[PDB]
C-alpha cells in the first residue's frame, strides 16, 4: 500500500 505524506 501506498504512503500517506505529511499534511
Known sequence: ???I???
Open 1 to 3: 500500500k501506498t504512503s
Open 5 to 7: 505524506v505529511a499534511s
